[model samples]
Target: QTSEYYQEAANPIATNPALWAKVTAPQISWGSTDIRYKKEEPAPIHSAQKSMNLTAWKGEKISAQLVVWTPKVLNDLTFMVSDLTSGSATISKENIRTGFVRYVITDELNKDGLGACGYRNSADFDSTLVADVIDHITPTLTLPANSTQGGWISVNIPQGTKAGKYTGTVTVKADGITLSELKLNLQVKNRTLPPPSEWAFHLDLWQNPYAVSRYYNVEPFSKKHFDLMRPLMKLYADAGGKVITASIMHKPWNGQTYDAFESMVTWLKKADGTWYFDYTVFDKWVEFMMDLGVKKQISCYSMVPWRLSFQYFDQASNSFKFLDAKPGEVAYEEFWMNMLQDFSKHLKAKGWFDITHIAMDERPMKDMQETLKVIRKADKDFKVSLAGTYHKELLDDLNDYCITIAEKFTPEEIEARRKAGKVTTYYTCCTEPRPNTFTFSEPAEAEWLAWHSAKENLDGYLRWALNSWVKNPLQDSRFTAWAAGDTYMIYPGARSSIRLERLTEGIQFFEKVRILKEEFEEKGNKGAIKNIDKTLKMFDESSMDKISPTTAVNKAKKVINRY
Candidate 1:
């Protein structure tokens, strides 16, 4: 009986509409009557039993939260939108569907370590990294009794959109009955948003091939794995990902499996203590990425892993071995030095040295200094990049510095670093204040980070991992130490979370602001520039009275439209 029940539930209904009408019916409703935003916390604020009357500019994009609740189990409830029309101006359903964003709701665990560590989860266990992860292209949302699922209804107003009042309706239906209807009234002003194609922000969201292979149960570095990865890689490229992470020889950290064939250099040892190198797979991967439009930069991960252990393939034993070795130590120093010399020569020969950097993650300053000296011994001009909390003194020796957003840096310090032509980007881990971009965090926070970076004049944004999968990540995102969704942003099946969608939207807004800044300067509109500066001041890190997200975008639109 249980198996029969499962089979029936999984079966798609067949035949005509009359047979479908005879099946058992379910009920649902809009959890809130209206969705509103005013540039504050708990954004896209929803109000029960109210209607939407919002104002936006011609070049602005705005969104409202839509929550659907089922008092009883509802299978396949369909949500649809009507065309927004005012006089001859019309916004089609296709626009609404294309802009639709979905949020992955996670259960918040206890807050015992809230102040000290940022977040705490009771169910702590090592996630078995595997390749059988599922990929979901679209949502198959089924609400159980008293359950709610929420998403965003985003609207993009083109630069040429008619400036006037437009009205539309979003309807939710289940069992062939209208469950809820949301009415929208928008006032579009005369302004235009810059095209996203002109976005200038440098975005580096690292991808893990090992994770992709494990989750998809594909062999690492195999043709099938790369084929499966094309869509995911293309998605990242389409979303403005600028940096492509390359593994030099082995996995860099956390005891993960290496993409053996994918590594740039292959090593062969002779019986009499000699070695040779091969760059076959590495060149293929780089050329493939170049073809896919990953031309901005190639960030080769680490001279070492997070721990003091270094891995090497042993010819005598015909297996890989980890040796305990610290920087400047005899145990592994010779091996790394030789590897760096060869790798540097290879990069130079391939015309990639100028754009490549030897990257590192969270490690102590003292150890990093020792490692830097060792690499310099091989090639004085080799660039070094680090992404972690570090002392300011270390910044003098680095080419790229990706600092945590929670870390404090004085305006003078930032200006000095930028003047020195260092690539400075802000990053976020799990330990930030509430309403982070975690799976459990409000979706608005993701967009907020991009806005904050632009306002602060930071070069770009960096997220540590894009495909770090956890156990059953599709169903539950909670990990042992960090908050849910900290390990990754993209889900298996190449699905994107609301956090990523909002981040893209925020980058688009940053580009719009940039265009306005340049235009204002060209026209000698000092007053407009001053107004923009004033508005950006409100968005600074320390300001107690911050403007709402909607208000900030609207203010930018006004500045752009003026003059």
Candidate 2:
């Protein structure tokens, strides 16, 4: 009625009167009034007042409750609480609601007297809050601040809470807010003890550049080349390996380079006389091995002439030469002696002398006495050994110098050395078709060598290139390259993984021998000899299966010890 003319009686204001025009002129205020909007108080912000809350008393086991508020509705909320002290953890997911919610003391808190809460979105949960909430007019909670926190996730804290810090966080999303985060910490007083030692198994990994040469033409010396090898190494280590020795060899020294050896020495050694040898793009090779907990062994290819040759001097040239024939069939022995001393000294400075075993093969001791004297004088801590083609006379002479021999030799020869006390140990030459040094000769030869070496009280079998050979069927030559028969002991290319396993087995095998020796020494000859027989049979089975050498060896020893 007011809008129809403000007069109920069928009276029209504009036409109700010729006087309506006069009445309309009744004074109206012409100035406009200022309309202003006052900002409402910002929605109360919830924040953790302190970093963490502590239990009221020292080491008192107390219950705590926390209230987790979010602008968004949480669905299927669950919680996982872990005991940092005991490593026992539990997951709780039950009786969860969508809105203002909480969790209770379903069980005791952790050793730290702490707990955490979280919610998992249901499968049907909307991806976007605006899309679903706008249509339904629902308030999608949001976290304007902290989202993830550590412990103390519930609402109430018992007065006698323990004396340690408790922390936790709530993950939340709210309407009209981007991702925000929060953190919480609570401290409690308690007499804390040192954490218990954790039991864990570690794997050691090693990769040798030369290993790549089995399938390819050369080992890549560049980063790209060795980068490819890290993953394989990691995989092996992850499998519970404790140690790995990766033998690396690479190019620029393969051929067409006479000075390669000299260059290698320079690159491998630092001015401080450390074994600065780098593998795969000048990365400290020794450090790499240490990081992986691996024992690093350096193999010299052309043992004597290649390495010692660098020691010979040039009387005419007045400078040392690696390869130079002396006048009248006389060689500069001092040159080599000095070189050995220098090399040994360098190794000692790096603290590597005690841990590393330096090896050489295919070396001829032109003057055995002089050569060994230098080595002995230079390095008293490290173990040094040399390998060469079988030379009965040479080997017999080397015993005086305590030259540990590694190579192919006749079974009779091995036994003879043992009986005569000429050979301290027997070494089986490793060759293709078989993987280990013990399998150097034919089947008959291998058996004989093992028996003789064992009888002779040899230290242990030694081999080169634990993982050598590749599975290459195609080649320019028509002949097919077959695997070495001793593959049980040695690895071949990518297939060489078995080689490491066998090596570990071999170490185990030695451990058995050690055990038997100890047992025999303790129980007397009768008991010891009986155990020896059992050990031999076990060894035979292990070798047959190519099972770990240790396993085979231990089984045999265990039986023998029964006597």
- Scored by TM-score, the top model is 1
- Over 341-392, each residue of candidate 2 has an lDDT whose tens digit, in order, gives 5556665676665544333444555533344444455555444444545555
All models: lDDT?
Answer: 0.63, 0.31
| The best candidate in terms of lDDT | 1
Candidate 2: worst 10 consecutive residues by lDDT? 128-137
Off by over 4 Å in 2: 1-208, 213-263, 267-283, 296-303, 306-322, 325-342, 354-358, 365-370, 373-383, 389-425, 430-456, 469-503, 516-525, 534-563
Question: Candidate 2, after superposition: displacement of residue 552 in Å?
Answer: 9.7
Candidate 1, superposed: residue stretches over 4 Å from native: 1-64, 81-110, 113-121, 124-142, 153-171, 176-197, 256-265, 409-421, 538-563
Candidate 1 has a TM-score of 0.77
User: Candidate 1, residues 191-290: lDDT per residue as tens digits?
Assistant: 5655433457878888777777786687767898788777777657756777878877555765432222135567555456776667776777777667
As for model 1, its CA RMSD to the true structure in angstroms is 7.6
lDDT of 1: 0.63
